[PDB]
A paper describes a structure:
WGS of the strains showing resistance to compound 60 revealed that each had mutations in a gene encoding bacterial DNA gyrase, a heterotetrameric topoisomerase complex comprising two GyrA and two GyrB subunits. DNA gyrase is responsible for introducing negative supercoils in DNA, a process that is required for DNA synthesis and proliferation of bacteria. DNA gyrase is an essential bacterial topoisomerase that is targeted by fluoroquinolones for which widespread resistance has been observed in the clinic. Given that DNA gyrase lacks a direct human homologue, has multiple target sites and is essential to bacterial DNA replication and transcription, inhibitors have the potential to selectively target bacterial cells versus host cells.
To validate the presumed binding pocket of LEI-800 on the GyrA subunit, we used cryo-EM to determine the high-resolution structure of E. coli gyrase holocomplex (A2B2) bound to the substrate 217-bp double-stranded DNA derived from the bacteriophage Mu strong gyrase site (Mu217), nucleotide analogue 5′-adenylyl β,γ-imidodiphosphate (ADPNP) and LEI-800. We visualized the entire enzyme–DNA complex in the wrapped state with a global map resolution of 2.9 Å and built a complete atomic model for the cleavage-reunion domain of the enzyme (residues 8–524 of GyrA and 405–804 of GyrB) at a resolution of 3.1 Å. Guided by the mutation analysis and helped by high local resolution around the binding site (2.7 Å), we readily identified LEI-800 as a region of distinct density, clearly separated from both DNA and protein. One molecule of LEI-800 binds to each GyrA subunit, occupying a horseshoe-like hydrophobic pocket on the DNA-binding surface just underneath the DNA but far away (>20 Å) from the gyrase catalytic residues. The quinoline ring slots between H45 and L98 of GyrA while the pyridine ring is positioned above I112 and F96. Remarkably, four hydrogen bonds anchor LEI-800 in place with the side chain and carbonyl oxygen of GyrA S97 (to the N3 of the central pyrrolidine ring) and the main chain nitrogen of GyrA S172 and side chain of K42 (to the sulfonic acid moiety). These findings illuminate how the main mutation (S97L) identified in the LEI-800-resistant mutants prevents binding and also explain the SAR observation that both the nitrogen-containing linker and sulfonamide are of crucial importance. The only inhibitor that partially overlaps with the LEI-800 binding site is simocyclinone D8 (SD8), a natural product that prevents DNA binding to GyrA. However, in contrast to SD8, LEI-800 binding does not affect interaction with double-stranded DNA. Inspection of metal binding pocket in Gyr–Mu217–LEI-800 revealed a clear density consistent with a single metal ion (assumed to be Mg2+ based on the buffer used) bound in the ‘A’ configuration.
Residue numbers in the entry:
A (entry chain A), C (entry chain C): 8 to 524
B (entry chain D), D (entry chain B): 402 to 800
The structure:
DNA sequence: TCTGTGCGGGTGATTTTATGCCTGAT
DNA sequence: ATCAGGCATAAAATCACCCGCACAGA
């Protein structure tokens, strides 16, 4: 029985729990804006083939795959974060299509897992673009035998167009949504000039944009949050007072409500405030929403003034709320408070890494294919001795070793092989012993097996010209990738075209109006 | 008091308000978002309710769902507090799901109303809602199908959209009034054959359509009946694909002078005999396949083809032509079957079920009072022996 | 508003529910002894590759696959029937291996789905034998796009070696377990003589066998159930009274308990009966089970007799229970009460159908392979004109149509083709125009494409003799299957060898003792 | 009264009975089947318990788990009814799971005992159980591994089972005392390099092992330092596989007369400079990789091979030989890591954790009373600013 | 002469803790 | 000046009905 102290048992146990919640549960990354829960759900939907132009699929399959293969943490929490991606009043740009009963703005809950069907949205395919070209890193599971990506190679700037809301041990985050066509313009303005100030970057991005419209009342709290990281804004509902043509009766019509505000609780609170005799001048209260939009009707008494009753409801009911901005995110594995310029500059660096990691993979694949096609094109000009050497061999192993024993003469392909000069198509691992020396060709063990697997229908006069055209196309594609890797202004020229294409395909309009006090 | 899960309406006058009974929060959430807020109310239920007939009066009052249903209507229970003129809604609508579990809940809900509140049923305040079952998307058009017979009629009509049956080249084709009648008669005969599988082999009955007919006067000669049974068993061995052997017998009888052929088969090493006696020849089942074979023995020569819209494919049998016509229409087709009200959007549930201008609804009535409560005792009572005899008797009627 | 009567609405709705529970939920089939719940679980474990000699797999994967693909009925009920297949006190022959915490005989519940690992047992592979050789029928799902087998092609007689327990609308079932080496002997005795009586069949099968041993007290209720279908037996625990060497103290030791009996409830009931002063002579009661088995110690007072106290506990506590036998099962889609001879005779018919459906599939596959190998062997004796005709063709379609235009002469394969006489290797769908006519060979469109897909490494001198040996082996295998399909005593000779092999591989010993009153 | 989920023992004398605290019915069911029935008792818990420091005294008494834990021990709570000599068990053992959620429950359970019943902790009645973490099956033998360091030692020992490093042909090989020391020193240097990645590139630091060493006296000549930096940056371009460009600079200084080389790189179009000043040359980090390189610059000529048991494969570097030696031992190996007590059979839990002859257990003591309750206020208190500064300070110590 | 109870495969619902920042009600 | 609630990922539990057949208790 070895004794321990209570001071070191408490310190060792509490730090193991606190570091796991910060890094592995909450506080999303700054490069893709996703928590570890969301990444595994999107990857499991990507593996199954649940595309946007195919048929719908039941959510029970997706939840079962996520639980059984990637995420061992519970069952009801996985279904709760799926329905947050499908509600139009919850996210600015939705990531799951969804069909069925997914709740309401009055507080209705969603249906069970057996009755709802989901599939990926079209904007969610831009987050997993070029995943199978070795652009990100992969990690293991809890029991091995499966691989999960460490980060996503996104093309769309998340953590700004959507937000974040999480509680950790010692810290928490709160980020509002924005508009896509403004943040893309800010990203292009950073590319054109890297010394852009906060004031020069704020003429493209004026403020936050919410999916429920309404009005932002004031500009002082927005400029403080973009310079420091912390600030406070006010959100106000949209309403008006109208009079009757014949009588002098007045009514109040409410068209929009603030962010994260329930409607039934608001109506119940207004009715309770009338019943307790704290707001005077209200005689009736209904709810006629229909399908054209939102409409709440409040009746005003004849002896009261409709402007004073409307001004009293702003400071007593939940028709004006407050939002506290606090931006923390994981940067190089540790939490950090960031301003607007740090988030923009951490996206272009990720784009640079993704493009320069895709180019090397494409170049290596092209050079391997050209190396195979050279030996395929050589052997079709020496058909009769190849067939004689194969037929005079007892076993295919001795036939394979007889092919590399002697050099093979060229003919009708020397003009093709001289065009690929300056060793631009040779693989990097190839020894200098093999290849084209003098007027003869030297084969390898890999090239000799490709001749023995050649089909008998390749001897026709049609596919040889197809092989020559494929060789020509491979040489052009090899030249362009080297021109991209040669310089840096060409690399920055590739990045701008993708951003303009994203802005063209997924453009939108501003819903929230920003005024002064 | 008033229940907490009830979503009331803005109308306070009775005989203008409606109440809907649904099957949980999954259907209740979808029903509340697509209703009319002025004069429609929703009340969810928590599952299978208590059986009134098997339970005593003391256990009924202590239940939680029954008390909620009693206090929602407001009329009362018992005899001292059963004034039925204090009813709050003059329309009670039952809208359970389209499963077999939804049919059980409707039975318990029907036996609660008849055994406890009979005057509401007698005055006509109880209705039954009918949601659709199938949704069919044909390329760019969507339709809703009520039941299975409408689905069969729809798929037959979409199979027979283009019907140009050419018997031979340089001959006029058949279309319109003849193809539908031939298809309907063939489907009726094929449905009759499948119910006869318990007494005769299925491959033998389908061969008798193309065979020449046997009359009662031909049973007095040996040569005709032995030639008929030899020609019957000659081609059954020729078209056999499952490894069976067919034989025949004459069976000369002395009294009631006739000659009845016998068919012998051996399937898996087991030998059985199927006699074709005088009851089968003069029966009504042989008459239908004889009248089918009058218009099918022939009508298809060599170089025959069919064309639906633009595709021509030669056929050698009527079954092959019908199968090619059916299989061509199932290319751009998607069929979805609903199994609950939580699978539908609130826009779809309003336009098909709850809109008072385009909905279909039933109204329950009582025909005989003596014959009604005798059926409730048999099906929902304590004793198990009349229930078992009632279930077993109706299974013989279908077969 | 079309009116309806309440008499026909009640009758139509109640019969739709009652027929679905009888056929589709409870009342297992007589040919394999399985409910529809068990068949989908075993099929989903068979599809995933969860074999008995591989590593364990989490149960969450299996439950997720069963819910998402085959069984749309709930989640907690699927996990409850999995753990009934893994408990050794519940089934006589277990079907799931299992590892972790799966409950106890004292009433402990199993652990959650995240902590347990399962795989198939070795005896469960005999239930799904020869599934992919077209021996059973397949049906659709609730939404299509998947196929589920209608029945299993089992080789082991279930519904007797295990039991059944289900409640339906109007009927219920209750069948006890039996012993495998006795029911196989009874099945062989039925094959040797089909007119075997109940008394002659009962000398091989004396009675039921339970996984918890104990004693069956009486023989009258067993013979009544095997002739009619209904009967009642009694099960008695095993116990004894021992004395001390020095003192005259006596103790009662309990070694075994009856079927479906909890142990903790039994000890609590005995303690309550002592406390309420209804059994006299008991001073102490413990539970010393350990690992060698089961042992319950009851102390006897000095002024009492240990035999009288033991005889009083049989008629008051749960040391003797009753079992009511009632055998109903689905036969041709309808319920039926059956005796012992009907269950045995319904198994041999299933075995006959499975063997005669496997033989036709194997014969058709062998004849198709021989038809391909003939055209592969012909074309290797005419290599030079084949190569010339391929090389003088612009497109592979014209090369394919040039092969069937002219007959090809034979040579060095006529002795091979003459051995396959009497048309024993021709496919049944083959037209009489093609094949071998005179000294020439006529190719088809299917045979001409196999020549164009021939690899270049098949021209060596090694693989030709391999093709000839494969052709010889195919001819022998074609002859044996026709000899099986020719007669019926050979068919019954094949069936007996499999039953003897099953009896040899999975033999056991009797646990339950049958005595008289 | 007595709790319903408590499984008591047959022993009534204290100082011979033990009590186990577990984490639900999943672990509680496995613990009850493999215990000793005479003197061991099990009490399950329902999840995360209340925080004592953040809650007042009124909310503590109304909790359900805390009341069950109080009435199980039998000593009492408060001050009027806190006689501590009525304790029923003289051993309290905490046996939570091996996750990070099990570490949180142990913290709340430790702060309940110290803040409410301090005399039980001071008299030494509280223990901590230690279940194993890994199960390793090597072909036919099974072993249990306590922690990660024992796992690293086990895999190093199973990699170095056969170590015949041949530098050249017709030469004696190295085995035993030299291979283990070389492997340990190389692993220590590789662990030191990975913590230095935040200030220097990883590919540059690994190249300095095989380069000749640079002394303080060589910094007074331009030619030696420019030859050293040119030979350093010559082969970094040769072995580059990710597309980077390397350059160099001289950086002549006037005061403190020295010559410090500069390394320039361009990775993704971004250029950074890494100076190698006087602090890096005389530092302790360069000394370890200099002492590693004294026994590695050389020692591998042409025609060199390694053999573990029977397999010979030629190598050209020490890293390739070590990787081939490690990868060969991971063929017939299976590793399972436990994350809960419900994953173990009751036979396995008894032989490793609960058997009083082959178990390992801790005993908590208090060293300083003043320094103990100051740490409980910082970590478990209401204020959030000392907690955030305590977490952030210890993250810098590891890096 | 009643009234519970348990066996297996189906339907539906529900409450209590940690961790951080801001509000309203007392 | 103190207390309670609502925002997203994580832990842990429990109770009420239909359906047939035999038995213990009152
Ligand atoms: O949780 S995330 O970090 N942010 C969701 C916000 C938080 C608050 C906001 C919200 C919450 C509730 C309502 C609401 C509730 C009831 C009635 N009327 C409105 C509205 C908005 N919704 C997140 C979850 C899942 C996928 C995410 C993907 N990219 C970013 C964030 C994601
Ligand atoms: O449910 S099946 O029709 N029969 C299980 C019997 C019923 C009763 C019997 C039993 C029940 C409980 C205990 C028990 C409970 C508690 C303590 N101490 C013992 C023991 C036996 N176990 C069945 C289920 C799953 C797979 C099956 C596969 N082939 C046949 C039947 C199968
Ligand atoms: Mg339902
Ligand atoms: Mg845990």
């Amino acid at each position: 029985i070895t004794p321990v102290n209570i001071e070191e048992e408490l310190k060792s146990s509490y730090l193991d729990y606190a570091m796991s919640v910060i890094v592995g549960r909450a506080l999303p990354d700054v490069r893709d804006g996703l928590k570890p829960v969301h990444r595994r759900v999107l990857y499991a939907m990507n593996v199954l083939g649940n595309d946007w132009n195919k048929a719908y699929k039941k959510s029970a399959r997706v939840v079962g795959d996520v639980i059984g293969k990637y995420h061992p943490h519970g069952d009801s929490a996985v279904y709760d974060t799926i329905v947050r991606m499908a509600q139009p009043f919850s996210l600015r740009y939705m990531l799951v299509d969804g069909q069925g009963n997914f709740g309401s703005i009055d507080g209705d809950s969603a249906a069970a897992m057996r009755y709802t069907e989901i599939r990926l949205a079209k904007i969610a395919h831009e987050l997993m673009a070029d995943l199978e070209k070795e652009t990100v890193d992969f990690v293991d599971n809890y029991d091995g035998t499966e691989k999960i990506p460490d980060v996503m190679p996104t093309k769309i700037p998340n953590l700004l167009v959507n937000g974040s809301s999480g509680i950790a041990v010692g810290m928490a985050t709160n980020i509002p949504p924005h508009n896509l066509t403004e943040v893309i313009n800010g990203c292009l303005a950073y590319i054109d000039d890297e010394d852009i100030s906060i004031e020069g970057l704020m003429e493209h991005i004026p403020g936050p944009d919410f999916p429920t419209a309404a009005i932002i009342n004031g500009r002082r709290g927005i400029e403080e949050a973009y310079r420091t990281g912390r600030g406070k804004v006010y959100i106000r509902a949209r309403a008006e007072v109208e009079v009757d043509a014949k009588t002098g009766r007045e009514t109040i019509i409410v068209h929009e409500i603030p962010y994260q505000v329930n409607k039934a609780r608001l109506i119940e609170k207004i009715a309770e405030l009338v019943k307790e005799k704290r707001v005077e001048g209200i005689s009736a209260l209904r709810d006629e929403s229909d399908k054209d939009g939102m409409r709440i009707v409040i009746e005003v008494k004849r002896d009261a003034v409709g402007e004073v009753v409307l001004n009293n409801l702003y400071s007593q009911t939940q028709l004006q709320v407050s939002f506290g901005i606090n931006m923390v995110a994981l940067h190089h594995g540790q939490p950090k408070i960031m301003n607007l310029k740090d988030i923009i500059a951490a996206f272009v660096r990720h784009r640079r890494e993704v493009v320069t990691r895709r180019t090397i993979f494409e170049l290596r694949k092209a050079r391997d294919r050209a190396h195979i096609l050279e030996a395929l094109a050589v052997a079709l000009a020496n058909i009769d001795p190849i067939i004689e050497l194969i037929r005079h061999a007892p076993t295919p192993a001795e036939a394979k070793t007889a092919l590399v024993a002697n050099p093979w003469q060229l003919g009708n392909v020397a003009a093709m092989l001289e065009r690929a000069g300056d060793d631009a198509a040779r693989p990097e691992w190839l020894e200098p012993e093999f290849g084209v020396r003098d007027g003869l060709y030297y084969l390898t063990e890999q090239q000799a097996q490709a001749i023995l697997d050649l089909r008998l229908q390749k001897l026709t006069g049609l596919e040889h010209e197809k092989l020559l055209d494929e060789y020509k196309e491979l040489l052009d594609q090899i030249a362009e990738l080297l021109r991209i890797l040669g310089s840096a202004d060409r690399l920055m020229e590739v990045i701008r075209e993708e951003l303009e294409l994203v802005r063209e395909q997924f453009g939108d309009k501003r819903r929230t109006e920003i005024t002064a006090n | 008091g008033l229940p907490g899960k009830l979503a009331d309406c803005q109308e306070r006058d009775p005989a203008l308000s409606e109440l809907y009974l649904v099957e949980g929060d999954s259907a209740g959430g979808s029903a509340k978002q697509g209703r009319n807020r002025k004069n429609q109310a929703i009340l969810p239920l928590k599952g299978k309710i208590l059986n009134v007939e098997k339970a005593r009066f003391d256990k009924m009052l202590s239940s939680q769902e029954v008390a909620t249903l009693i206090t929602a209507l407001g009329c009362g229970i018992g005899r001292d507090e059963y004034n039925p003129d204090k009813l709050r809604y003059h329309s009670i609508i039952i809208m359970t799901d389209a499963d077999v579990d939804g049919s059980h809940i409707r039975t318990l809900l029907l036996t609660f109303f008849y055994r406890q509140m009979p005057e509401i049923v007698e005055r006509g305040h109880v209705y039954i809602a009918q949601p659709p079952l199938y949704k069919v998307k044909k390329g760019k058009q969507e339709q809703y199908i009520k039941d299975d017979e409408a689905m069969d009629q729809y798929q037959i009509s979409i199979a027979l959209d283009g019907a140009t049956l050419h018997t031979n080249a340089s001959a006029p084709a058949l279309a319109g009034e003849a193809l539908e009648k031939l298809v309907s008669e063939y489907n009726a005969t094929q449905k009759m054959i499948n119910r006869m599988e318990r007494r005769y082999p299925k491959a033998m009955l389908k061969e008798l359509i193309y065979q020449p007919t046997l009359t009662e006067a031909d049973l007095s000669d040996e040569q005709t009946v032995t030639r008929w049974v030899n020609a019957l068993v000659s081609e059954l061995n020729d078209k056999e694909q499952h490894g069976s052997q067919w034989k025949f017998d004459v069976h000369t009888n002395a009294e009631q002078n006739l000659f009845e052929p016998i068919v012998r088969v051996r399937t898996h090493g087991v030998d059985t005999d199927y006699p074709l006696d005088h009851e089968f020849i003069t029966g009504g089942e042989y008459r239908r396949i004889c009248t089918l074979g009058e218009k099918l023995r022939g009508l298809l020569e060599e170089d025959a083809f069919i064309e639906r819209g633009e595709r021509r494919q030669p056929v050698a049998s009527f079954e092959q032509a019908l199968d090619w016509l059916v299989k061509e229409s199932r290319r751009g087709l998607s069929i979805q079957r609903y199994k609950g009200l939580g699978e539908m959007n609130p826009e779809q549930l309003w336009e098909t079920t709850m809109d008072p201008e385009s909905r279909r609804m039933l109204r329950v009535t009582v025909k005989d009072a003596i014959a009604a409560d005798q059926l409730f005792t048999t099906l929902m009572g304590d004793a198990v022996e009349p229930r078992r005899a009632f279930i077993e008797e109706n299974a013989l009627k279908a077969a």
